[PDB]
Design a protein around this ligand. Structure first.
Ligand SMILES: *[C@@H]1O[C@H](CO)[C@@H](O)[C@H](O)[C@H]1NC(C)=O
Ligand SMILES: *[C@@H]1O[C@H](CO)[C@@H](O)[C@H](O)[C@H]1NC(C)=O
Ligand SMILES: *[C@@H]1O[C@H](CO)[C@@H](O)[C@H](O)[C@H]1NC(C)=O
Ligand SMILES: *[C@@H]1O[C@H](CO)[C@@H](O)[C@H](O)[C@H]1NC(C)=O
Ligand SMILES: *[C@@H]1O[C@H](CO)[C@@H](O)[C@H](O)[C@H]1NC(C)=O
Lengths: 212, 223, 277
């Protein structure tokens, strides 16, 4: 069996009606679907069971419906704390947790303030060096980057992480590194990293040169 | 008042065994099935196992089938998760939560949850960080958004905490979650957005706090 | 946690006749073939005795009518049942049937009886769980389906179980498990007698006087009781709170007590035979 929510994520400002599709491979016996709300750094709360039954201490704005192989959690109007991943669970004769569904605050797309950082002098003589590019206070989550070492395209040697949506300004920050060895650091001259993003008309690249 | 607490998380090398404890208080504990729900970083909740309130029935997901066992002491009001052959992906936060009814051959939704404990499976030994400054570029290179942060490398394990200027600086800080690479250790970066005219003109320091290694390192950053 | 499972049934209860039924030796006095007269609370002869229905499968595998009520306990109750399957396990003698009020409890694990008086929290429809326990068909009899909370409660008692499942095992008589309860001066008294009734349907025309089982130093103001049932917890069933339970159906006969006097006929066996009013 495999249960899947949809979409991958939903990005909405406060107040607008939001639905969370839940599609099941087989028909879940007697509509034994349940939902959960989980905020990062917390534990999941229990929202609805039976695809429609509001639970205790739950605001009335949370609701949902469905049967068979098609489900939907709906939230009529959104509040600032109501933005956390939602999980869709069926609990008949065996549990199964949906892939997850995140709800995001949206606003005007933001230009990522993109900066770069060459390893320190102590980094190189340490025998290992990683170059870190940064994408500061931007929007939305989806934004792709690529790394060009001496303009040569890299692949499969980078790690990146995006901070969770900030409370006040509701933006994102991105920072990628390189799983680079020092021995490969000196064998090149200029290091570049670019982003193809909604907030920018063109893919901007910020780079530098070894020796400065 | 209803509240669960779980303990027994922490490091372990693959193949060994660990026995998670979940303590309970605030309801007729020996009257409810208890589930185990785990959540690997970046992934959604994956249900694991549920125990019948009296223990007559035990069920596990095929993800851990034949490799996890569940036990409980109704007198102690406490839940025990037995694990052996802990593969790599098994590391996650682990949640203990109670059924809504006598989980006997059937399992309602988990209604009230604990607070989660983290298990990390790795052959890596405990190790502090390798804190490296992040030198700012020329005076601005952007305008009024000066970039400078700190890189911590090859440290293990998380949690870890970084404070800029003894925590007195919080506005505009940006600290990222760490990532585990093919090395097996961890690494992350902290950074804060500051005006260009403020760089150098006054001191910036990042104060990493790595508890298990008992290593708190201050760092100084220059362009 | 408990469940609500009557929820739709209010059909009028049935009546019947208490011909000569509900007598008991009101003392431990050894006696001979003489005539005696005693006055106490008793079930009136030919009383318009109430008959109930517990779990009631009135339908072609369609419906599971289930209407165990709480009942008044004005001054004493007469209780009897056929119920060949030992689906009845005791009673919930009390006054308020919730917290902040000590109330009495009767249950017996088919091998021994345990008696409690406590400030329980008897849920609206108490019952017991009878269900296989992974070890050789064995089954535990958890009672969490009765009281969500019992605490700081005084008196307790344990003994051999009342409901002897005598070797009938065919079914023509049903042994008509029968009981009489009264509570006076803080003392709670117990009377019963297993007695085969080969009659198919209703109460007998014969005579049999119960005997004092146990007198209980209780000291509670019992005003209203509820019978306690046992249900076989179903296996994996969509829904487990208000759903599959209750192997077997059940019903029982209830008739209230009242103060009265009667003239009794002892024997050389000291066995009462009849009384008159
Ligand atoms: C159970 O159902 C009955 C029938 O309406 C209702 O009166 C009672 O409040 C319900 N109890 C619960 C706990 O829902
Ligand atoms: C019991 O009450 C019913 C109700 O009408 C009545 O028909 C019947 O005769 C009564 N039986 C008695 C008083 O023995
Ligand atoms: C019934 O309750 C008594 C109380 O002590 C216990 O010892 C006994 O094991 C129980 N029997 C069953 C079958 O549950
Ligand atoms: C102890 O008994 C008193 C009454 O005798 C009651 O009010 C109190 O709640 C009891 N204690 C507890 C912990 O229930
Ligand atoms: C018993 O409780 C009932 C219900 O409150 C009350 O009417 C009656 O007076 C009480 N009797 C005694 C002796 O406490």
């Amino acid at each position: 069996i495999v249960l899947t929510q949809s979409p991958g994520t939903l990005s909405l400002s406060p107040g607008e009606r939001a639905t969370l599709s839940c599609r099941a491979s087989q028909s879940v016996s007697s509509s034994y679907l349940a939902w959960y709300q989980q905020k990062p750094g917390q534990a999941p709360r229990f929202l609805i069971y039976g695809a429609s039954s509001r639970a205790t201490g739950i605001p009335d704005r949370f609701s949902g419906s469905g049967s068979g192989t098609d489900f939907t959690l709906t939230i009529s109007r959104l509040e600032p704390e109501d933005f956390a991943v939602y999980y869709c669970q069926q609990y008949g004769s065996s549990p199964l947790f949906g892939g997850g569904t995140k709800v995001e605050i949206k606003r005007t797309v933001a230009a990522p303030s993109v900066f770069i950082f060459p390893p320190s002098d102590e980094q190189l003589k340490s025998g290992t060096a990683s170059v870190v590019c940064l994408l500061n206070n931007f929007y939305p989550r989806e934004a792709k980057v690529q790394w060009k070492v001496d303009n040569a395209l890299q692949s499969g040697n980078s790690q990146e992480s995006v901070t969770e949506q900030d409370s006040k300004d509701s933006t994102y920050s991105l920072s990628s590194t390189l799983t680079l060895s020092k021995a490969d650091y000196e064998k090149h001259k200029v290091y570049a990293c670019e982003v193809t993003h909604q907030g920018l008309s063109s893919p901007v690249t910020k780079s530098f040169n070894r020796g400065e | 008042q209803v509240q669960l607490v779980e303990s027994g998380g922490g490091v372990v090398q693959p193949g060994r065994s660990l026995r998670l404890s979940c303590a309970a208080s605030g309801f007729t504990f020996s009257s409810f099935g208890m589930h185990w729900v785990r959540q690997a970083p970046g992934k959604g909740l994956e249900w694991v196992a549920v125990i019948s309130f009296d223990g007559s029935n035990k069920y596990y997901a095929d993800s851990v089938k034949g490799r996890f066992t569940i036990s409980r002491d109704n007198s102690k009001n406490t839940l025990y998760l037995h694990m052996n052959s802990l593969r790599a992906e098994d590391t996650a936060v682990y949640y203990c939560a109670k059924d809504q009814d006598d989980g006997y051959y059937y399992y309602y939704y988990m209604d009230v949850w604990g607070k989660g404990t983290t298990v990390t499976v790795s052959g890596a030994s405990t190790k502090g960080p390798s804190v490296f400054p992040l030198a700012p570029s020329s005076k601005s290179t952007s305008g009024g958004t000066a970039a400078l942060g700190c890189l911590v490398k090859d440290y293990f394990p998380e949690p870890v905490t970084v404070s800029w200027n003894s925590g007195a600086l919080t506005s505009g800080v940006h600290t990222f979650p760490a990532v585990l690479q093919s090395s097996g250790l961890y690494s992350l970066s902290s950074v804060v957005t500051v005006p260009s005219s403020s760089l150098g003109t006054q001191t910036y320091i990042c104060n990493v706090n790595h508890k298990p290694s008992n290593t708190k390192v201050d760092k100084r950053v220059e362009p | 946690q408990c469940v609500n499972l009557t929820t739709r049934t209010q059909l009028p209860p049935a009546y019947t006749n208490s011909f000569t039924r509900g007598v008991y030796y009101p003392d431990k006095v050894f006696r001979s073939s003489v005539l005696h007269s005693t006055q106490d609370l008793f079930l009136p002869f030919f009383s318009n005795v109430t008959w109930f229905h517990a779990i009631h499968v009135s339908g072609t595998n369609g419906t599971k009518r289930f209407d165990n009520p709480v009942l008044p306990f004005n001054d004493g109750v007469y209780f009897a049942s056929t119920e060949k399957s030992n689906i009845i396990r005791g009673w919930i003698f009390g006054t308020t049937l919730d917290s902040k009020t000590q109330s009495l409890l009767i249950v017996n694990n088919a091998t021994n009886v345990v008696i409690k008086v406590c400030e329980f929290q008897f849920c609206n429809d108490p019952f017991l769980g009878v269900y296989y326990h992974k070890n050789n068909k064995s089954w535990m009899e958890s009672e969490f389906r009765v009281y969500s909370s019992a605490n700081n409660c005084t008196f307790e008692y344990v003994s051999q179980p009342f409901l002897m499942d005598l070797e009938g095992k065919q079914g023509n008589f049903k042994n008509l498990r029968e009981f009489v309860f009264k509570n006076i001066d803080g003392y709670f008294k117990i009377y019963s007698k297993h007695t085969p009734i080969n009659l198919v349907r209703d109460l007998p025309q014969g005579f049999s006087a119960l005997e004092p089982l146990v007198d209980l130093p209780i000291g509670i103001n019992i005003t209203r009781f509820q019978t306690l049932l046992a249900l076989h917890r179903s296996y994996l069933t969509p829904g487990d709170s208000s759903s599959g339970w209750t192997a077997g159906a059940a019903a029982y006969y209830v008739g209230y007590l009242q103060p009265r006097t009667f003239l009794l006929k002892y024997n050389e066996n000291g066995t009462i035979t009849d009384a008159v009013d």
